Design a protein around this nucleic acid. Structure first.
Length: 186
DNA sequence: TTTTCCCGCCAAAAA
DNA sequence: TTTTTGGCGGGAAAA
């Protein structure tokens, strides 16, 4: 009971990846998030919401209808990271680390897009990370006189933590100290 | 002590 | 309206 890991996002995420094969074929494929809430004794739907939203940021899954997702799988993965490299503003990111090191729709908004730009920034000759990339999220997110500092940035650290441990479950990431980098599949 | 991050209020898109 | 989808921060367990 006392342990906080029993309700950690990476447990139910590991079970979520256990629910479906990484390499399926077009069969009777469907997802019902409330049926996931009922098939086990947990949890509140918001957890499956953020897990599903981060899952579709890499095109691993797709929306079909209300309470109706399709699992798809590992096919696009490499094509998704490569298309993200076509979208990549990598020079702005590496230059942003040079700054921090010393001295469509307006409200899309932040979840899937931040996971996408995270997966984009993961590729570089010298993988560097990660709260500096949170500062990149503040600069891309604001780029205005306010600032509006102190607040906001910590919550981006929180959702970035959720993106971190959710990407720690049978996927392309490591567990190295803090500020981690891995992309197993090129 | 700081870092890690869960729970869930509460409000925007759908129904 | 009620419902489904998720931002958003607090507040505490864990390192």
């Amino acid at each position: 009971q006392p342990s906080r890991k029993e309700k950690s996002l990476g447990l139910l995420c590991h079970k979520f990846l256990a629910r479906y094969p990484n390499y399926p074929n077009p069969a009777v494929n469907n997802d019902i998030c409330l049926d996931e809430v009922a098939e086990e004794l947990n949890v509140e739907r918001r957890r499956i919401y953020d897990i599903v939203n981060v899952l579709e940021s890499l095109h691993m899954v797709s929306r079909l209808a209300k309470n109706r997702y399709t699992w798809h799988g590992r096919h696009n993965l490499n094509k998704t990271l490569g298309t993200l490299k076509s979208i990549g503003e990598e020079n702005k990111y590496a230059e942003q680390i040079m700054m921090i090191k010393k001295k469509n729709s307006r409200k899309d908004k932040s979840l899937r897009v931040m996971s996408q730009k995270f997966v984009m920034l993961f590729l570089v000759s010298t993988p560097q990370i990660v709260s500096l990339e949170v500062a990149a999220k503040i600069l891309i997110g604001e780029d205005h006189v306010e600032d509006l500092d102190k607040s906001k940035f910590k919550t981006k650290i929180r959702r970035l933590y959720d993106i971190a441990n959710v990407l720690s479950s049978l996927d392309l990431i490591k567990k190295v100290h803090v500020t981690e980098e891995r992309g197993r599949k090129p």
